[PDB]
Structure formats: structure tokens, C-alpha cells
Amino acid sequence: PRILNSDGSSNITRLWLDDHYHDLLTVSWPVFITLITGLYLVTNALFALAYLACGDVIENARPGSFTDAFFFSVQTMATIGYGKLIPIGPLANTLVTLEALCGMLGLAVAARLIYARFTRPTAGVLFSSRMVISDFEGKPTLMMRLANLRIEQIIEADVHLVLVRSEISQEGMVFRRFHDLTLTRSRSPIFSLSWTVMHPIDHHSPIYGETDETLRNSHSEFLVLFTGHHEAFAQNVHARHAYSCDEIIWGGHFVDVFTTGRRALDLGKFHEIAQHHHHH
Amino acid sequence: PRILNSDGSSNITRLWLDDHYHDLLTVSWPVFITLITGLYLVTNALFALAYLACGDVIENARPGSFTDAFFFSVQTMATIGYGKLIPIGPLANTLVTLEALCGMLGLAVAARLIYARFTRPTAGVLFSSRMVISDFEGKPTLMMRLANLRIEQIIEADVHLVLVRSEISQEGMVFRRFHDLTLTRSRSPIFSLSWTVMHPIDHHSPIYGETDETLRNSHSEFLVLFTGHHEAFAQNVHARHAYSCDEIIWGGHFVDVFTTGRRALDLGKFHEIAQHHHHH
Amino acid sequence: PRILNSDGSSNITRLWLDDHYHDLLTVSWPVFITLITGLYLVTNALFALAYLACGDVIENARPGSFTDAFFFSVQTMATIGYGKLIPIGPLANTLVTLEALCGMLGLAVAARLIYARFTRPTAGVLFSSRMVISDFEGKPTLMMRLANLRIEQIIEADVHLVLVRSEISQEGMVFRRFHDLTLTRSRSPIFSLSWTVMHPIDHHSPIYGETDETLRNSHSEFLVLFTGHHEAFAQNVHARHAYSCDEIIWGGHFVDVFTTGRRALDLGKFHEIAQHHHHH
Amino acid sequence: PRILNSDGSSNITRLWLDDHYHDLLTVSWPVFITLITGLYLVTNALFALAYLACGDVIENARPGSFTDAFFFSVQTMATIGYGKLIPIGPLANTLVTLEALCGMLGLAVAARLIYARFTRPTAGVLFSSRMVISDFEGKPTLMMRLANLRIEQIIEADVHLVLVRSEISQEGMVFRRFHDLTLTRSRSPIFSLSWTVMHPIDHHSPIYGETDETLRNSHSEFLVLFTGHHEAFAQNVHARHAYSCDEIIWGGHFVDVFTTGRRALDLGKFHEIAQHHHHH
Ligand SMILES: [Cl-]
Ligand SMILES: [Cl-]
Ligand SMILES: [K+]
């Protein structure tokens, strides 16, 4: 199987309030809403019971009634204060002091969690479906390409092309090792349209003299990581992708995406790869 | 035409709620306000209809009246609760529980979007109108300069001078390639007033022995990117600019901006470039 | 004793509102809550006294009563406004203008402090209990390992292995010096499961020809720092750890954690270290 | 005079709502409060006038009275809604819809500006009062030192020592140039107590064979920049300082600050510099 999925995430399987902030960001929206709606009603229900424990302390409430106690809580906590249900004495007015404070502080935090979850940036970067190993500038070169899917530019953009493969030590240790493949240009200070990433395969490159045969044997994989500062979000963005030997087009050439000055960019041609065809 | 505009942005033309966070930051203020004002009234209108669906559940409302239902919603959602229009029974008080929560959470988020849009930092950096190619320290050197337009300093400031030009491969591939021009000083840990950026043209420089003639031929362009941590905003800032061959003053020398100790800085002289004039 | 504790923090002992923001983040939750609850009641108590200083300016209050004045403040500050206690005249309505503003601005800030304290990211990274000095790729190599304790990946992850030891200058100055040990791979662009960090001990390494004997003599310590961008938090995370000579297993080999494709990762084996046993 | 003050800021003198976000962060607290208090009253005053323009639309208001109109605004904007002054008809209830929204959005933003200004981190770093040029490891070395003034550590801490001095080009151009002095250790991944920063003066150092005489002549200055990630704030912090020739103690040696294991750190000795005294 694939050690790395095509989105860069790993295949491998792993083996209450300890990691609260992580879980409140990663848990699904249905759970998250429920969880907030849970705390909301539970806190009002606990405050209501305290109002009833004081005695008949809500001006137009039914004596010993939770419903009335509960709704007087949501009016105090939300700071609506219609004025039909109003507190009586020092205990009911102290609890109001405490509940108005709980309500103001608490909900403000729940809403910044909602915002945190909602204001997540995404690098609108599109990775080419395949990689090509063709001769460029008199040297076989491993290539792939990225494109921005938005008008806005990406500042100090850098890319990492990593070979991940099985190896055998000088002693006899069989381990998977990551190689960070040296690229002609790893940083593009302003990435706005398209970028073909090239790794010239030389006597220093870990894939020197390596054929499709030998790449499949070491179960070689190529993991790509793009990172850059987005202008639209004014935040740093990241994007990642992973390829296998089945996703390398030996001899393939990427088709030009820039048309016509009046210059254009067709993202149809983005995954288009040219190839010479030998005689049958 | 110009591949890069003078502000660094590219010329080239590209070819509902999928990219919500990006669009809510990039859409214009008139659209943004409308969009928030839209949701505001639409949510109150949907809550109003639910109050009417329960029956005569608003204490001083006209029966079957939306206006009354609607304004009781904006008083509940905004948590004003005047007390003339007050809820009756369990359904109207449940909807209030839900609407007070919707109103508190929702508006808090809309206001942090307003803040996000409003609290954007700008590197108050001014790029010189032209570049000069003059002999400095016994070597022709490509220069340009930046100035800070505020009192506050910029920490860990770095600049990238990138040559972008048409090239032909050893095979015959005609492609545009970016060169990151090596500068005498790419980082200024504390940038506060002015910085002349120099690229000494040597046998390693991509513009070695290159004249205005040959630079226009490869439709050469120079893209500059400034980045640094601003003290005033306590955030990182960035600024960018682009030049063409028409914006290079061969033999030009930048005029000194620092006057008189009692030292000064005249930003008039900032774009002023000295030049020798040959006999006619 | 240990110059560095096992969590990386130093042993050494050091020798009102000057550092407010730091202290409001570092002070304990019991102090922090008290401090907020303090300001809350103190501000309402100061506003109450001003209402009493105006005269009988609260519609259904007992004349000269602080309790009534105080609760009318918490209803104004929290913006509950039940309507039983309502202001009378220009002074009571001006103070309301001022208190509603104080209450809105103040509590909003107290809640973002609560959020700041609550939304702290933690690199769920587990450092191996020991380090090993075994021959890997025909060179004795100092190793240790890290593991991620969450599904979510860590982007642009880097690790620093620092030797900290007593030294004597060419003059005769006895000082403690930190060496940043060169690692085969200091950056893992995508760290998701496990990473064995290796420092090949060569004629350039500060621990060349160094035995347990000589390492204890210079009271050598090894400090590890992990840093990376977390996907779950969408923030940068950091983690650190420190070892002594008693925590180095000479000849030790880390046990493989990756089982079986159907690949797994047992974190039991994570601290497991294999060792050859000489004949007695 | 001093080109750079001792806090790193430059001496040199420079020569409505264009830079709003910068000015709202840099303007003084008295101006800032006034500015917010300004907008607050001005917005309520503009809303009041609109309520009066509708006619007698406030239930218990005096007809044609601004005071009453104004206070009904602050009760609507702050969302207090006591209920004595309540809106009448569609125009007064529409304006309430608009003002409750203006009040909720507006104040939320004003409070995040208050927070932004208040939650500024400071690197509690103390720079030594002087620098020393003494022989360390058989080479004259320019040194200075930093200390942390808090328990909490500073992660990925880096320091820049920059020589700033007057120079003359191979042509005859007299310019001030910054040299970034190469340090034995520019990065301390974990800075918690003290760090002596050393620049070994070698045939590559810009201050090679340079005496106090020649350093004063080129009006040499030394600018130091410290940057690092603070644990307490969970943010990056920075600190800077500048020295002149009058602040260099030729032959000086920094006194040890670490006492006694039971290790200590006396910050009294921090500025203490030892010196040999020649015979008179
Ligand atoms: Cl916020
Ligand atoms: Cl925030
Ligand atoms: K309210």
C-alpha cells in the first residue's frame, strides 16, 4: 500500500479534558455546537437551582418552578433583562452579579472559539497530478508544478521536495530514510501564478542512476511541502502532497500554461504532460 | 507590455460559500457591510416567523404582526430587552434561549471580522522610482533604495532583488526564469531611515556584461520584495515593487538624503539621481 | 546536582503593575479569577458611591443605600437593565453613559485575557527517556527520538541537540559552553509519527573520543529543543528536554516502533532500548 | 553627537485618517481614551438627532428634548434597555435595529484596540552597560552580555552585533556602512539566565587592528539586536541596544554572575567589569 496518501497525510494506525484546546478546534461542528449548547443550558440549569435554593427570589415567578428560574437565568446570563422576572433581596442579586459575570466572560470565549475554527487560512495551491523525469539543461531533472487558485500573491513562498525510501546501513540496518531533494529554486519571494519545481539529478542526488524498477523496489515516495505568507489572509499558509513511482512520467514534459501582449493562464493544461511515443 | 506592474502585482488574466473566510476579507466594504446587514435582518426575520408560528407569544404585540415579531427579535438578539414586548410560555422562552445565544455568538464573530479587515499592517516603505547601474567599489553595481515613512523602526528587515527574464535551454526550451540577485547586505536587523540595496555585477551575476540593449531583448524586469517586523504594529510587514529597463539609470548615482551635529533626512532627494553629461 | 532538570528548565535561583501583561498570563487561575472578580466588584463599588454622591438618583432604591446603589451598578455595567432600578436626572444618566462604556470595554478585555490563557498550544511530542551512543553507518552516533501524540501533523519541524559542558580556555578561563551538535537531519518538513535524531560523532564533533568517564567530569548535559508548526492549532509549537550522562545508554539501540501492509505504531516500544550483554 | 541613542533608536529628525491603525496603536492613552470617548458621544448624539427628526418617538421622553433622545441612544447602543424610554412606531424601531447593530459592532472593535495596545510583549532582557575587548582563546575578542529578568525561558533566541561606521570607497565615496559582526554563537535555542556574546577579532573582522583612536575617528558605533520566542507571552519578543567607543572597556573582563551545588545568579555583578591596572 501507500505509506503516504496523495494529500501528504500518513496511512499508519496509532496505538476527558486533558487536551481541551486541541479537541475544541478539531472536534466536528455538530459536536462543537452541541458542546457549546450543552454548557449553555447546563450553566443556566445550575444557576436556576441556586435561585430556587434561596427561596421565592424571582419577582413574577411561580414558586418552586424551575422553568421560571431557568428563563430568569437565560435573561440574566444573556443580559436581556426584560424586567417581568426581576431578582429579590441580597442572595438573588449576588447570584445575578456572579451570573452576569459568568455569562459575559463565558460567551465571549465560546465566540472566540467559534471565530478561531471559522478563520482558518487555506493555501489555494494546486499540485500537478504527476511528476516528470525529463532532460532539462543537459541533466535528467525530476520536476512537478504548483499554481495559485486566487488573484492574491503568496510572499516568501518555499517548497520542499522530499524522497522517502527504504535503505540498508553499512552494518545491516534496514530503515526508511527521508532525503530532502536539492531544488534549483526552493524560494519564490512572490508566487502568484505557476511554479515548476526542478531537482537536477546529479552524482549528489539520491535518485542518481535510479530507474522506475529500483524506485518501486525501495518503495520510494515523494513528499512535497509548500509554505508561504498569503496576502489575502495576511497569515502564513501551507499545502502538502505526496507521489509514488506510479505518479512519475519518465520522459514527460509539462505543457505550457501561459497563453496570449494580453497574457493568460489556462489551468486545464496544468496537469497536461507531453510525451514522445516510440514506434511499435 | 509590462509582465509585472510597478507595484509588483502581475498583469496576466486568469482562466458560493467554498472560500468564505478569504472572500469575507477581500470583498469590498460596501459588499461586506451589506452582507453583515443582510444576515442580521434575515436571521431576525427567520426568528420572527418562528415566534408567529407559535401563536400570540409576544406580550404587547399585535396578533399575527411580523413588524412586532421582528422588533421583538432585534430586542432579544441585541439583548436590549426593553420589556414592552416580552415572551409568553415555554416555546417563546425557548426561542429566546436560542436567539439570545445566536445573537451573542453571531455578532461577536461579525465584529472580529470587522476588526481583522480594519487591523491590517502596512510597511510604510517607499521604493525609489528608478534603479541605477554605477561603479561602486571598483565594480559596476545595480542599486536601488528604500525609506521608512514612520518614526518606528523595522526589525529583522530583509530585501530580495529578483531578475525575471526570458532564457533558452541547452536543448532549446524558451522559458522565463527568476534569478535571485545576490546583494552586498540582504538583512538590516534595524531599518529605521534609508537603505541603498546594492548588487555588485560580477562574473557570477546574471546581468554580467549585460547592456540596456540585451536587457530589453530578454524583456528583463526587476522585482523587489521588502519584509520586516514592524515595531508600531508589533507584526511582520511586507512591501514589494517592480522595475523594467526603462526604469534603470545607467551611470546614475543616488543623491544623499542625510543633511545636517543636528542630522536630518530630506525625502525630496530620495528619488533624486545624479548623472554625468557627455559633450554634444 | 542537575544544572538542567529533565524538562529543560534550569535549576539556578534568581537574585506592583510594572509587568502587568506577563503576570496576568503567568499568575495562577485562583489568583487570576480573584483578580478579575476583585476589579469587577471594586469598579461597581466605586460607581455605586458616585451614584449616592449625586443623591437619591436611582428610581426604586432605598435612599442612602449602597446595596441598592451597588446592584443598580452591576445591572448598568453588565447592561442587564431590568428596569426596577432606573437612573434619574442628568448626573445619574451621565454616570450610566460612563459605566455602560466602562462595563463594555472592561469585560471584553478581561474575557480576551481569559481566552489568551486558555488557548495555549502544546506540542504533543514525547521525548525518549534515554539517549544511545551506538555505531550507525560506520561511525559512533549519539541518538535520541521524538514521537507525535496526536493524529495531526507538525509542519517545518526542527530539532536542536545542544551539548552543555565545563571547559578551560587557552589562557585558563573555566567556563560552561554550549555546543550545538550537528545532526544528520535537523529539519523534518512533515513530522507525523516518529523521528530518531542522530549526531554522528566525528573528528569535528565536541564529544569525539569522549567516554562516560570524561562526560561526567565536565558535568556534560544534553539539551534538546523541538519546534514546529502544528496543524491542529494552526500555530507554532515548541517542546524541550534535557539529559545527563546517567541517561546515555552506550551501545544501546532503539527498538523499532513501526509494526504490521496494515502498518502500526506501538508507543510502548518507544522507550525500549536493545543492548548486547557481555559474558560474566 | 550619538548617531544611535543607547536604546538603539536613531537621533536624526524627519522631513487625517490615512494611517488610522498605526496611529490608534501609537497615539498616547490620554488621546486614545478621548478619541474613543469622542466617537462614543458623537455617535449617540448623531443617533439622538435622528430620533428627534422622526418626531415624538421615545415613550417617556420630553418632546423635542435632546437629553432624553441622547440617553435613550446610550441605553439602545449599550443594549441596557431599562424600559422607561422605549421606541414608538416603525422609524424609531428601525433606528434601534441600526443603533443596536452599530453599538454591538463598534464597541467590540474599540475594545479589541484597547486589548491590542494593552497585550504588548516585552523581552525582559538586560544589556550590559559596557562592552569589553579582551583576549579570549588566544585572540582579542569584542564581548558584551544579556540577561533574562524573568523565570520563563526564551526559545530560538538570536543576537546581531552590528558595527556601524564611516568609510571611503575605492573611487572616493564617503558613506556610513553597517557590518554584521560574526559571533562565535549567534543562536541560543534556550536562553534563560545569561549569555556573553563574543566576536573574535580576526583578519576577517572589520575591527581588526583597530584601536580606540581609529574607532572614534570613523565615529564607530555598535548596535545590538536580541530576538526570541518568549515562553510567558507565547509570542516573539525583541530588544535592542547601542554602544559607542566611550562604552568599550579595552582589556576589561566580565565578572562571573553565577554563585553557589545550590547555584545562584547575582545581577549586581552583571555590569561589573574587571581590569588590570598598570603601575604609575
Ligand atoms: Cl479577539
Ligand atoms: Cl484575537
Ligand atoms: K444587554
Ligand SMILES: [K+]
Ligand atoms: K451585551
Ligand SMILES: [K+]
Ligand atoms: K434590559
Ligand SMILES: [K+]
Ligand atoms: K439589556
Ligand SMILES: [K+]
Ligand atoms: K427592561
